[PDB]
Amino acid sequence: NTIRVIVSVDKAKFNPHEVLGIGGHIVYQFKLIPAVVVDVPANAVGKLKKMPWVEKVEFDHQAVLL
């Protein structure tokens, strides 16, 4: 049902209150890069993609200990 993705934003068009509108919520707003970690419904990826303030959406990948 929900998925966590990282959205690179256009700071000229972004306000964190925009996420709720597509069914999501913010997990973390980066201080040093223009990006936000968000939880959204899994069938909402396409919809996000088409949003003006969205520059890139990336899935949350896995790293492992070496």
Binding site: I6, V27, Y28, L32, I33, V37, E58, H61, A63, V64
Partner: protein, 318 residues
């Protein structure tokens, strides 16, 4: 608690003879270790743990509880860098360096890229939450700030994501040396983040100076990563292998370099690049003082070679 021994790896990277000059205890210098957390009260580590934080699930927490090591890997890595030089246990490459333990991997030893990225931001921001308090552009090596000078990542994955790279770049531009494990699949090149140009990819050698079969190829440098004895929970010790074990050796070396340079000059060295073969950059120094194994020059197995603290510090101060 057992009597202190110097693990073969610490000997191999020529750390003991540096300690008279510095053991890394220069106050402006911190090493951030982004890993499974830390046994924060381990008697061989506690005095060097300067900050214990977690970024798991995207929530920044300093609850000692949330930041403690539930795997052991983190504790082991940290002990290779910063185990205290005393009467017990082991001893790190830089046995007086301050550590920031940033827990970005969970009890399983796995982590989200997002959590790692947050982890890198915390290393930059420091406990005060602000990267550059006085706005002068100087972050790493500014005594007014509390940024780490080294970011050590004994972890990796196959994805190359732009946001994580953007954060890597932020670290590099803050003047922080980034060090990462090359990976353990015997692959032809390093995993991420080691494969970024701004990061030092580290391969693993064994005690016979051979490259480990599992070591991802084409690293920048190499270091001890087979049969590595270090700290482990709870208040104990264990022997492990991996490019995760080699990486802290390198981070320790870099800590010594920056500490020694700051002690003498009141500044740190620039990070430098992969190609650097000069004395005016950390990475340049690492490359020219490494023990060139295998075929002459940089090669796919050992990189430029095995890091040597003693020689790197001499080059830095000369």
């Amino acid at each position: 608690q057992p009597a202190q021994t110097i693990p073969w790896g610490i000997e191999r990277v020529k750390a003991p003879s540096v300690w008279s000059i510095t053991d890394g205890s220069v106050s402006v210098i911190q090493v951030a270790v982004l890993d499974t957390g830390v046994d924060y009260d381990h008697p061989d580590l506690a005095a060097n743990i300067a900050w214990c934080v977690s970024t798991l699930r995207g929530k920044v927490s300093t609850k000692l509880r949330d930041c403690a090591d539930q795997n052991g890997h983190g504790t082991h890595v940290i002990g290779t860098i910063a185990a205290l030089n005393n009467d017990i246990g082991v001893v790190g490459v830089a046995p007086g360096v301050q550590i920031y333990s940033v827990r970005v991997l969970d009890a399983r030893g796995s982590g989200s890229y997002s959590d790692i990225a947050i982890g890198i931001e915390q290393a930059i921001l420091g406990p005060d939450g602000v990267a550059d308090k006085d706005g002068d552009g100087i972050i790493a090596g500014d005594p007014d700030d509390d940024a780490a000078e080294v970011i050590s990542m004994s972890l990796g994955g196959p994805a190359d994501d732009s946001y994580l790279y953007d954060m890597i770049i932020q670290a590099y531009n803050a003047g922080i040396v980034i060090v990462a494990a090359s990976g353990n699949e015997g692959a032809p090149s390093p995993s991420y983040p080691a494969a970024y140009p701004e990061v030092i990819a580290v391969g693993a050698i064994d005690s016979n100076d051979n490259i480990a079969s599992f070591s991802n190829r084409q690293p920048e440098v190499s270091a001890p990563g087979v049969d590595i004895l270090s700290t482990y929970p709870d208040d104990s010790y264990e022997t492990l292998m991996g490019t995760a074990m080699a990486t802290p050796h390198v981070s320790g070396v870099v800590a010594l370099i920056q500490a020694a340079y700051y002690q003498k000059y009141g500044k740190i060295l620039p990070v430098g690049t992969f190609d650097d073969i000069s004395k005016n950059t950390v990475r340049g120094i690492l490359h020219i003082t490494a023990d060139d194994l295998g075929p002459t020059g940089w090669d796919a197995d050992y990189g430029y070679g095995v890091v040597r603290a003693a020689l790197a510090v001499q080059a830095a101060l000369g």
